[PDB]
Write a protein that binds this ligand. Structure first.
Ligand SMILES: O=c1[nH]c([C@@H]2CCCN2)nc2c1oc1ccc(Cl)cc12
Ligand SMILES: [Zn+2]
Lengths: 306, 88
């Protein structure tokens, strides 16, 4: 309420255009608000307004906008309608999509709905990865899901980096995500981090969906998450994989790799196919070179026929 | 020499970092669904701040905030189509 007032004051032009109703999201680097506006084309429309923290470097602001303009608005990737600026305050106006809380729907989705969710996530990931965008903060709060409408939008390019050959110019001139969704090569600070790190994240999401638990890896720092990952995927397996990316991991307590089906079943629909756990295993590959890509994921037997 | 349990991470070509907890993570199946089985700095002024509001109000920030450094942002904005109705 006081936040709404301060936003209007920071970007005065907003009061000419929007009736700002409520704050619908908040992260380290932004707050997202629900607002109403009148379209010239006729309809009134619900709008999401994303106020970026005024400490963002202009290049960071610009790179996020460029992701939205170039890659967004298609294939379950959020696009941008307009952008408002007064000085250091930038507000991105995007279409509003009404959406579920992940906690709410988690234990109430049918299995077919689990597979539709994952299929549609991989469509969004394939799209951004085609442009050489590494999202770096893929998690349920950044993947909008309208259960009723079966609509999906991947959001928030505010932590993105480019691949070596990225098609988003500003990304070459480039902030840490949630520990629980970060890949082993991320947690261990590998200098080379590719699109594979987002595929790991999608596997953590899939792990929550199959086990009925969220947040799966509940960790406030990177090494705690790594320790939790080792109890799932195995310490020896993690130590071996980390070598392939130039990291030496020592662990005092050896813990075995878990069977994924048994893990998810004990944590948690009557005949989940082997293909689901096989796909999970590929998503949670400890080696980022061998980890499945979004394009490969879409062709996985788990998704015949959709 | 490190008290157990620990995790240690080093780059294979050289500064180590560590984890030490009372207990290592343990997969808890008995905890009920949906609980986990395991249950600033300014980029503009290139400086860490004490308080956000007061840092924004500082002449260092105000100066950046009002410069031409957001040209790169306005350049993309100019390419977008304004399709809302605007009131006076
Ligand atoms: O970039 C976003 N981040 C977020 C969240 C909140 C701040 C951290 N990520 N939400 C949205 C974002 O864009 C949106 C567009 C429409 C709707 Cl309904 C929500 C969002
Ligand atoms: Zn500053």
């Amino acid at each position: 309420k006081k936040d709404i007032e301060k936003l209007y004051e920071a970007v005065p032009q907003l009061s000419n255009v929007f009736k700002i109703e409520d704050k619908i999201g908040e992260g380290t680097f932004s707050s997202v608000y629900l607002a109403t506006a009148q379209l010239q084309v006729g309809p009134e429309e619900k709008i999401a307004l994303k106020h970026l923290i005024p400490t963002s470097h202009p290049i960071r602001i610009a790179a996020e906008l460029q992701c939205l303009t170039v890659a967004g608005g298609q294939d379950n990737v959020m696009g941008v309608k307009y952008c408002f600026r007064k000085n250091d305050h930038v507000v991105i106006a995007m279409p509003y999509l009404e959406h579920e809380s992940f906690l709410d729907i988690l234990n109430s989705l049918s299995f077919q709905e689990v597979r539709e969710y994952m299929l549609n996530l991989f469509k969004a990931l394939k799209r951004i990865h085609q442009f050489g965008i590494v999202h770096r903060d893929v998690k349920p709060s950044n993947f909008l899901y309208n259960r009723r409408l079966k609509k999906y939008a991947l959001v928030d390019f505010g932590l993105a980096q480019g691949t070596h050959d990225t098609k988003i110019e500003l990304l070459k001139f480039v902030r840490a995500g949630t520990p629980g969704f970060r890949a082993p090569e991320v947690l261990t600070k590998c200098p080379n981090q590719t699109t594979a790190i987002d595929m790991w994240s999608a596997g953590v999401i899939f792990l929550s969906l199959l086990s009925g638990r969220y947040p799966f890896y509940k960790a406030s720092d990177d090494l705690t998450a790594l320790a939790q990952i080792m109890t799932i995927r195995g310490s020896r397996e993690t130590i071996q994989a980390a070598k392939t990316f130039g990291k030496s991991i020592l662990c005092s307590k050896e813990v075995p790799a878990q069977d994924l089906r048994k893990l998810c079943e004990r944590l948690r629909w009557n005949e989940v196919p082997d293909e689901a756990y096989d796909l999970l295993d590929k998503l949670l590959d400890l080696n980022p070179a061998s980890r499945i890509t979004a394009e490969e994921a879409l062709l996985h037997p788990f998704f015949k026929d959709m | 020499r490190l008290k157990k349990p620990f995790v240690k991470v080093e780059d294979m070509s050289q500064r180590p970092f560590y984890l030490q907890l009372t207990n290592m993570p343990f997969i808890n199946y008995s905890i009920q669904k949906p609980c986990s089985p395991f249950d600033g700095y300014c980029e503009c002024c290139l400086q860490k701040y004490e308080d956000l509001e007061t840092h924004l109000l500082s002449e260092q920030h105000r100066n950046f905030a009002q410069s031409n450094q957001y040209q790169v942002v306005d350049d993309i904005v100019s390419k977008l189509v304004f399709d809302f109705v605007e009131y006076e």
